[PDB]
Amino acid sequence: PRGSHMTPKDDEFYQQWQLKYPKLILREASSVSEELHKEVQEAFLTLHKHGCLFRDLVRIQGKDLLTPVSRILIGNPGCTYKYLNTRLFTVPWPVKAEIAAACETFLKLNDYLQIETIQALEELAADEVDIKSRAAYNVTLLNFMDPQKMPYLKEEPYFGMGKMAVSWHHDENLVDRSAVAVYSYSCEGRDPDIWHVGFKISWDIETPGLAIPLHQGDCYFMLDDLNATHQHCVLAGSQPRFSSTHRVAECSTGTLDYILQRCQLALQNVCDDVDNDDVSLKSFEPAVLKQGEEIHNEVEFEWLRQFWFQGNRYRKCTDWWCQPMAQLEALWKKMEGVTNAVLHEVKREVEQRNEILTAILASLTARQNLRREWHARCQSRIARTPADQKPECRPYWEKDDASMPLPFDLTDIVSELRGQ
Ligand SMILES: Cc1cn([C@H]2C[C@H](O)[C@@H](CO)O2)c(=O)n(C)c1=O
Ligand SMILES: O=C(O)CNC(=O)C(=O)O
Ligand SMILES: [Fe+2]
């Protein structure tokens, strides 16, 4: 009921770490090459100067909020990482010129950490494919903050660890039991002026948490189920700091290949001799239409609106997604055309044959709600606060637009479907 935490200044700290955090590894700067250090530190600097790191206008727990920390997702080409309901797209790295050079740097840093991890994971066990898979980092999220540009920072509420740049949380959307590697770059009770990473047992508020000091060049690893059993935070220092958190993102349903295939799957129900607006369906089996409208929603809100909300962003560091994102829109547009098709069938010249109503009604109302939601987050008050960062509500078109088969809805079509 006093608020305490532990640091290496305490006696119990070492027995707490060894007996209650055996899966938390720390490798001090003195263990990593100076050849690697300077290179990755130079990378954080070019990328920062180039303005590739932005804070995200997230909508956590129903509220629109800008994030104190600025970040950049770098990793396998075609891969994405969902973080706080927002889906970040990877600026690609050389998976078999400055911005391109840095991604090369963070690629070797990745290989490095990967090695450090499998090793430490083997030393821990004291199959071998589980180790390999759980340390196979496919992405790295880079972060940055300060110099205290924050008017007032929130104070850690449980162990008096002082100010914090990132509150207690778990790294989510990761492969089960996957490890996480962090390279900390601090460019200059716990010492207020130094960055630390906080730790605590989930649900546990009375076991003093650990605040481990982070100096320029230090790396820490979270192995096995540690990330799931414990929460961590990042207590703030006085200087600004960078960091690259390499992870193994659960990317089933999360790569360009996956979503492209999903599209080809839905369009298998449309005569594909030519690409015009006389879209005809091979069948109106309530089940196939279900899957068709579901994929329509998936490519629309999980990919298109998600990509454009970040507005002109990754484009300042990569063009990689321009054409694939242009193709998903073409694909989606064709799907708007299948919707109109189904709509023409349902209300045309049998009547139980309206299994085509209780098979697409759920997906259409969802397309309705999610469209308002996104349109709102776009022309919202907070969203007025950079020019090249402001969210875009694409795909968007005015009711008076001829090229689109249906309107941006607003219902009427949805209401009318209640009919019966
Ligand atoms: C769940 C979760 C949260 N945060 C950060 C976002 C903010 O910086 C802070 C509070 O949401 O935690 C984060 O960086 N990752 C990778 C997560 O998986
Ligand atoms: O910077 C760190 O040490 C840890 N950062 C994070 O929590 C993160 O990137 O999600
Ligand atoms: Fe984290």
Swiss-Prot record:
Enzyme class name: oxidoreductase
Q: Which GO terms describe its biological process?
A: adipose tissue development; DNA alkylation repair; mRNA destabilization; regulation of brown fat cell differentiation; regulation of lipid storage; regulation of multicellular organism growth; regulation of respiratory system process; regulation of white fat cell proliferation
What main location does UniProt list?
nucleus
Q: How is the cofactor bound?
A: Binds 1 Fe(2+) ion per subunit.
The coiled-coil segments of this chain are none
Q: Where in the cell is it found?
A: Nucleus; Nucleus speckle; Cytoplasm
Residues where N6-acetyllysine occurs? 154
Activity regulation text = Activated by ascorbate. Inhibited by N-oxalylglycine, fumarate and succinate. RNA N(6)-methyladenosine demethylase activity is inhibited by fluorescein derivatives. RNA N(6)-methyladenosine demethylase activity is selectively inhibited by meclofenamic acid; inhibition is specific to FTO and meclofenamic acid does not inhibit ALKBH5. Specifically inhibited by R-2-hydroxyglutarate (R-2HG), an oncometabolite that also exerts a broad antileukemic activity.
Binding residues for substrate: 71, 83, 169-172
Tissue distribution is: Ubiquitously expressed, with relatively high expression in adrenal glands and brain; especially in hypothalamus and pituitary. Highly expressed in highly expressed in acute myeloid leukemias (AML) with t(11;11)(q23;23) with KMT2A/MLL1 rearrangements, t(15;17)(q21;q21)/PML-RARA, FLT3-ITD, and/or NPM1 mutations.
Q: Where does Fe cation bind?
A: 169, 171, 232
| Any one GO molecular-function label of the UniProt entry | transferase activity
Listed Gene3D superfamilies? Alpha-ketoglutarate-dependent dioxygenase AlkB-like, FTO C-terminal domain
Q: Region Fe2OG dioxygenase domain: which residues?
A: 7-252
Similarity-based family: Belongs to the fto family.
So which disease is it linked with? Growth retardation, developmental delay, and facial dysmorphism: A severe polymalformation syndrome characterized by postnatal growth retardation, microcephaly, severe psychomotor delay, functional brain deficits and characteristic facial dysmorphism. In some patients, structural brain malformations, cardiac defects, genital anomalies, and cleft palate are observed. Early death occurs by the age of 3 years.
- Write out the function statement from the record: RNA demethylase that mediates oxidative demethylation of different RNA species, such as mRNAs, tRNAs and snRNAs, and acts as a regulator of fat mass, adipogenesis and energy homeostasis. Specifically demethylates N(6)-methyladenosine (m6A) RNA, the most prevalent internal modification of messenger RNA (mRNA) in higher eukaryotes. M6A demethylation by FTO affects mRNA expression and stability. Also able to demethylate m6A in U6 small nuclear RNA (snRNA).
Q: What is this protein called?
A: Alpha-ketoglutarate-dependent dioxygenase FTO
